[PDB]
Amino acid sequence: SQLLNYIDGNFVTSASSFANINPVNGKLISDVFEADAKQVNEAVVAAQNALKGPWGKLSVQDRAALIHKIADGIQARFEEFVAAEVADTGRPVHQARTLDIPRAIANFRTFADLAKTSHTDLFEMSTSDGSGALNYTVRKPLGVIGVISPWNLPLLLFTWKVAPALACGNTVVAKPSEESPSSATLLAEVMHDAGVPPGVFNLIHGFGKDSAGEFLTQHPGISALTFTGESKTGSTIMKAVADGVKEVSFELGGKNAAVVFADADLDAAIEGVLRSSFTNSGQVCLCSERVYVHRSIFDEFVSGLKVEAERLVVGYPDQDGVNMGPLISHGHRDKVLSYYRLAVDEGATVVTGGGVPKFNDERDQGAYVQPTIWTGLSDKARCVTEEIFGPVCHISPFDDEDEVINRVNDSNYGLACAIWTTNLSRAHRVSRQIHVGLVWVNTWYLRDLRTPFGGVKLSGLGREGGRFSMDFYSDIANICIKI
Amino acid sequence: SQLLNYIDGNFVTSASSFANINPVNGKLISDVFEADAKQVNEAVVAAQNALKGPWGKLSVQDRAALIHKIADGIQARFEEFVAAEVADTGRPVHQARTLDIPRAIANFRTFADLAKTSHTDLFEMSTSDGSGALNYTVRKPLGVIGVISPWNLPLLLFTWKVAPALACGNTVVAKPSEESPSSATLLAEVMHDAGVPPGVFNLIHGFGKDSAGEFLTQHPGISALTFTGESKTGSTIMKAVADGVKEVSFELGGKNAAVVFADADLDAAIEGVLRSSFTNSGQVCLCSERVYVHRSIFDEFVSGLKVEAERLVVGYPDQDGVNMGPLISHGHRDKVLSYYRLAVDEGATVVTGGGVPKFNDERDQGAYVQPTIWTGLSDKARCVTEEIFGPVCHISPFDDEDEVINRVNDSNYGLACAIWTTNLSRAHRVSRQIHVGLVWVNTWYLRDLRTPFGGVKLSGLGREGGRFSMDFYSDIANICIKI
Amino acid sequence: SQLLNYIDGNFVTSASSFANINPVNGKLISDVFEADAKQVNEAVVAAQNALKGPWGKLSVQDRAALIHKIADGIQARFEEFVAAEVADTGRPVHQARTLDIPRAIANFRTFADLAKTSHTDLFEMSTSDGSGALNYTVRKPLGVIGVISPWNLPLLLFTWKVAPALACGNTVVAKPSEESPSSATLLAEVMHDAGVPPGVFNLIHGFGKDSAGEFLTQHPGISALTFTGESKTGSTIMKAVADGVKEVSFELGGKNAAVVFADADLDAAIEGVLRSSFTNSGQVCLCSERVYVHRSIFDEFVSGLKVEAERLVVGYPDQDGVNMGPLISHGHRDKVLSYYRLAVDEGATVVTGGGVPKFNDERDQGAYVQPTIWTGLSDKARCVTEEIFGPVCHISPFDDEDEVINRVNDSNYGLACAIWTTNLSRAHRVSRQIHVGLVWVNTWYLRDLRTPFGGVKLSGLGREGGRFSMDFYSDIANICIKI
Amino acid sequence: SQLLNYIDGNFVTSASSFANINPVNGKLISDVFEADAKQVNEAVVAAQNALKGPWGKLSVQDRAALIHKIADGIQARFEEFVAAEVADTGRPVHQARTLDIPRAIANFRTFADLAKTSHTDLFEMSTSDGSGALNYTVRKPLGVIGVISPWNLPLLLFTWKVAPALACGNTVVAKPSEESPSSATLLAEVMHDAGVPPGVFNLIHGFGKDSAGEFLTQHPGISALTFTGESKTGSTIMKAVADGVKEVSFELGGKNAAVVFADADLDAAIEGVLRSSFTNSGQVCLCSERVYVHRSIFDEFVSGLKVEAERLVVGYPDQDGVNMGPLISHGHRDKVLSYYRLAVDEGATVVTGGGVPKFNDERDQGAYVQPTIWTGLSDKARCVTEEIFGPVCHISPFDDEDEVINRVNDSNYGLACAIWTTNLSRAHRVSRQIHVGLVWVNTWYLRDLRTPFGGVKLSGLGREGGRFSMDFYSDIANICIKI
Ligand SMILES: NC(=O)c1ccc[n+]([C@@H]2O[C@H](COP(=O)([O-])OP(=O)(O)OC[C@H]3O[C@@H](n4cnc5c(N)ncnc54)[C@H](O)[C@@H]3O)[C@@H](O)[C@H]2O)c1
Ligand SMILES: NC(=O)c1ccc[n+]([C@@H]2O[C@H](COP(=O)([O-])OP(=O)(O)OC[C@H]3O[C@@H](n4cnc5c(N)ncnc54)[C@H](O)[C@@H]3O)[C@@H](O)[C@H]2O)c1
């Protein structure tokens, strides 16, 4: 099986290729052609030209209809997209089917609808001569949007950027993660088959440094770079586009906390922290890797979580009651197991997990690890401060509300937090004091595409979602008429 | 020893001082204490800590009242601020009195008012269990705002950042231009006398590279850097904050066009382009340095503009009919004159100006140049494409509408444009096609503080004004309650 | 044919029926069962109950999809809807096909979209005790919406109300005009086939006074009455709902002017006023019945419009180049011809028309009149001040801009106005001074569903369109949480 | 003393006068001159004319500044305003001082501020010919606003209407309650001394039916009638303006509930219901006259409330620890005592109060009654369903959440409700189900002037507050430019 770039309406190979590997069993899924600098230039230029072609002449309404057509096309190939996400990543099929693929479809439909409903502003003003002036704003396409995305929820995060970009009338050059190229390549097929004009959507495959990703970031022809990934990568990209002063929007790492207050529904909080720590095998940017539980219920919480964690089924994506697939790759697993050893070196108690399961079948050639809970580290331990991106959490007791707020906030990251409490005042009083972009109370990972989304501190720069997307992916121009 | 830093509620000197020179006559006005890195650190830490003191406990209504007090305090010392602005810059007293200081005061009043009226959003959503969830947003202080400002409209541009920063509950570390330190120092005393708590507003003086500006830019304690100045400096700052992923907001250079169609009110357009070319001796970022005039009215337009330009009075800030003061510095004057010569070398006709006036008095020791009009350069001439930031414009003829639109947009800058036409269709049709942040029709430099304001391409990153400032200077946090 | 009511998911007949006559030839199209007070009661109660059923449990997203399905269901039977509107009203087929049915579909699709994208407000406040409070707002269904609609654009105006009502989660009892019952009845079939729950949409046929219209209006079970029709009728309805303080939204009569300035594109203005005067045989509330033309071009304009009006083809709905059908009914034609005579009596010069065309075939039994232009009446003439609602206009000269603005505003009505001028300032200066809900410049009847729509003075009460509909058809509720 | 009307910038008397009685001691405070129909016409015509005068030429910033000048004028005579409100209404001095006058001043400042920051909308649209069109909206003054207001919080409720009316550039004819004419008359002096142009604000004294209130409501010269008062009065006014189709905004009666759940903070709930029942001697429209308390805490609740109610000091407005003044007048006291008896006759147990206190001084000639608590009535009792508007409440046990929601909602009124609970889910789940305009959770009568305010069913029509006021008190006009 082979995955080509899609540039100016044509699927094309490249001089070099790389392997896409199935993390479940370590087997080759496909060969992926790595776009070189010459090909990235071709994509950007094609995207610049497409802005002046038929795409650029579409009414907002016709543009929106075509985008609903893109979504219809994904839906018409639903299970192919499910199979592509699962193969690349080891994601349980049930989660790809009910969450990932429908959300990627919803991304297109929501931003197409926002495109149709969105409007801008009128400001009247007085002038010296008494005749007045009017200032009105308009939204125009920003230009060519460079999209660079990660491997953890590949189609969802890719379309989260591509949908608003296109809804705002931009053209796109998009570089998915080398670990998860397939569903982006299928999306290119859907675009083609839907009649999306050539150059409007371009797909380039490859890596970051000295590859497609870096070349995209360096190209003078883009107007913006939108990015989801590691904070360090964000910094590198920000430096790269600096001379061009390109617009930038970054969703970066986190080390998210969950707080369980004494008045929590304890069984629910146990279930919720279980989901927030081990969903996608801890490979969601929104996962909790630090947990704070009031001292009065600490021991009961930890015992309860251990029992639930140990009932998790780790195995095949379509295995009967499977809860966790593997990590994305052998390389990522090396990093996570290296953090497993560090926790022990730092003096953790391993409440459960802390190694890899033994399957005695092909899964032993994949990249699985066990769900893991630690106890007994200090707030300054590396395993409590650094993002691990695996199925892990450290649990720590606390006594006082102001205390735990400060401890949650004591971080260079600030993406998300989940809080468990049945008390009205506490929910609102505490939530507003947490230094993050997103707080959930008594739940986790609930998303409404209308809301602003982003992080603070090292977890990002800017916000997207709803009108924040419509603003980021557009030129906002002011036109002032003297009457 | 005259102009001090203001750090954590105290005026402090520094280890070294630099001269502030009057561009009217080259005389020493004052010595300015240059903040060193240790003092910049002290300012950022004090601002960090002030977020945790009484300032951070004010209601939005009390904060807004205090900000109106700052405004009142400027008003109460109105003529001192005029004198300080005039001394530093050579600005005509009439202009500083009727435009600069009033507009500085309006920045504070407008952002104080917007702080009281602003609200956020409520999103209801359905959930699988049928009980729903509520998502709501809140604006919170972003943190410590680093402000780095330019010399051209010193107090106006300084307060354009400081007012929204404070209105959103932030604390501030602000570095005005080394060329124009006085009004900002007076503002520090106004803050002090109004009882702004210590650490909320801090003033550090100095240069850019290897001085207070660079140091502010590198400090991990700030949450954002908002900047107005040269594009190259914007790039440098973007790189400097990259490792911290700090929020950035840049208002950068331009090479703005004016366009005059055959159906313009010719006298009004001549008057308008005279203002847009030579106001503040061509030292406003929004000035026109490129002008395109329809061939049918070209000669008449140039002839009329020459007449009006030669009637401009260039002299003392309190001289009876003064229109233009000097340039900001000898150093800037040398650069503008280097362009004056480049224009001739590039083949220009000098319609008027092209040199420095001879005053036969102390003004000859200052930094004056003549209002200058060029004709005969090609679109690729350096003098037609690089920002000069002096009292100059090149005038070129055009024939077709799509032609002049292309020539206007054929630039790495895109700050503003002015269009002169009496035709309703043309006004709206052409304006929407100009790739800039701001288009004026039949006027220039009308500003309503509610409007989004910014540039595209090298002219900027992001937008400020109205809700765009309220959003930039705030954390926008989403709180999601499961019901 | 027979047209039944639709009450609680069942098509039902009534004790009595009335004739629906084809205005083309006077022939019987169908019998229509007239709802009595008892059936109106059944519809209202069923509507109240359906609010507590499955309809009320739908998510906004599922409600919007069901509303898109209604729209699909109309599309699926598009030509039946065309044939129904044409039969009832004599509308040229081309207009019904390109304008009326597609707009009725768009009403559902647009308000379904708005429902998905709409949100509400979050207000934070300080309190004495320093802990604060949160006020958030929600949009809830108002309840049962009573809809009473007119005969001139039957399906379009009927769905303009029913779409937002349903999109906001309300249930509906709707009473279309007795002259034009067919497309509304077809719409009930679409609702049924699409699986809209019983009681959500109820259709009651009948008249106004002493019939279904009045009975709806008196029923204490409705929460709102939204209405489009004559100002007099509006006044009657307002009195009727007064004891119950029902929410009301009225779009009422007009006596709309067109103004043609000396710098107009004259040929385009002639064509414009032709359309605004004689579209739908002058039976649109937005038509121009008063026209003011600058003295310098008055004679040429009148002569030009005469020529164009005499070129209009008045004939069968599917006749080759047909432009005008008949009036709605013999009774309406009696009223219009009564004004034709009054005009002559008031001293008008009949420039063209002023009677009935003679066909010498079955159309002579229909309700046709001639397009008519008058000249020579004073501003106080009844024919210049009272709404005729036929294909007529009076044309008068003017000299001065303030004079003509005053003459346009000298009316108890204030729905719309169209202005013709090529001049940028004049367009904006004059438009803002016209005391109406809607001004068009160099066009007429361009409608964007997101805009506010409504009239002033006798022409209405309230606004609909965009968020104004979302607000009118919802309870806006404030919830204040003390923290 | 004498209270004059204020018409076209002159204080004027009338042919007839009526007495203003102090309810504390039944002494005459002043004679009030009753506007006749001719004086009302004179006021309306002056307001119409003033729209075309200097008022109408003010920039929004100058208008706002003059409105702040009105507020300043009130502040400068603060204690005079306090004395006026106290004299008229018997309201405790501390309450008029810390709440009523300050809030009246804030009404002006807040709507002045909103006027400066408010803006409107721009909609771009595609057209057949590919050139497009622009629709923009503007806010214009609606015209002459008729204001009719109640006696319970005279200045607060008066200025709640007058402030947005004027902030939106309208002119005003205002008729305060005959029971409380003083603070409004003082306000006219402030308007006069602040230099508000003649005709902009006109004050007419008199009664309702066959007096100034009725004449206002019948005058064809107004553009809107905004009203706060009884529901039957609202219905009367709605009929009165119907023929002119005037815009209407009604804030009408309530029979508001408070609900105390088992998990409430009991002492806080007891204090909260004490305030919500007996504030202003129960003469606020927002007061709780019905209380539902969970069965498990009902007895403890009633006993607590009895104690706290009996601690209330009923007496002189300036008496040391005074909590309650008298009722507004002897007539109102007759109605309230009539209810007190009816409560007995209907089966009520009197837990406390139920008659009039005995002073043995001039207060016995006043209009005092005792704070009263009933128990043992059915949900259908008149005393439980009809608004009494005195310091009274009935308390009833409940068991189930859905039960008490249904009992709260089983009312022809729907103004406000307060809920007491410490549980997060319950607070939000129950609040959204209460069919009123305003729900408070764990507090009462907290008011943020940006929020929408209004009632459902008999409690009102329309919303006011924040942009809801900016919309109601303005013409929203759409201007569509074909390009
Ligand atoms: N709205 C706008 O877009 C706008 C408005 C006004 C001026 N400008 C631009 O500003 C420029 C003129 O002002 P200027 O000469 O003062 O610009 P500048 O870039 O040379 O300096 C501006 C500020 O940045 C500081 N600075 C310089 N180097 C720095 C560094 N390495 N690190 C941190 N800070 C540094 C300076 O000390 C000064 O305070 C023009 O390009 C003009 O177009 C833009
Ligand atoms: N936010 C609210 O909804 C709110 C607020 C405060 C008071 N209220 C209500 O106000 C009522 C008590 O106030 P009130 O006793 O002064 O009401 P009142 O209705 O009887 O009338 C108040 C005003 O209306 C005038 N008026 C009376 N009859 C009129 C008529 N026929 N035509 C024109 N004007 C007429 C009166 O002169 C007076 O100025 C209560 O029902 C209370 O619920 C409601």
Numbering used by the authors:
A (entry chain A), B (entry chain B), C (entry chain D), D (entry chain C): 18 to 500
From the paper:
One enzyme in particular, 2-aminomuconate-6-semialdehyde dehydrogenase (AMSDH), is responsible for oxidizing the unstable metabolic intermediate 2-aminomuconate-6-semialdehyde (2-AMS) to 2-aminomuconate (2-AM). On the basis of sequence alignment, AMSDH is a member of the hydroxymuconic-semialdehyde dehydrogenase (HMSDH) family under the aldehyde dehydrogenase (ALDH) superfamily. The complete AMSDH model includes four polypeptides per asymmetric unit describing one homotetramer. Each monomer of AMSDH contains three domains: a subunit interaction domain, a catalytic domain and an NAD+ binding domain.
In the structure of the co-crystallized binary complex, an NAD+ molecule is present in an extended, anti-conformation in the amino-terminal, co-substrate-binding domain of each monomer. The electron density map of NAD+ is well defined, and the interactions between the protein and NAD+ are equivalent in all four subunits as shown in Fig. 2e. The NAD+-bound AMSDH structure is similar to the ligand-free structure with an aligned r.m.s.d. of 0.239 Å. Residues that belong to the NAD+-binding pocket are also well aligned with the exception of Cys302, Arg108 and Leu116. On binding NAD+, the thiol moiety of Cys302 rotates so that the sulfur is 2.3 Å closer to the substrate-binding pocket and away from the nicotinamide head of NAD+. Examining the wild-type AMSDH structures shows that in the NAD+-bound binary complex, Glu268 adopts a ‘passive’ conformation, pointing away from the substrate-binding pocket, and forms hydrogen bonds with both NE of Trp177 (3.2 Å distance) and the backbone oxygen of Phe470 (3.6 Å) to leave space for the reduction of NAD+. Its electron density is very well resolved and the side chain B-factor is close to average: 28.2 Å2/28.5 Å2. The thiol moiety of Cys302 is 7.14 Å from Glu268 and is unlikely to form interactions. The electron density for the side chain of Arg120 is partially missing in the binary complex structure but very well resolved in both ternary complex structures.
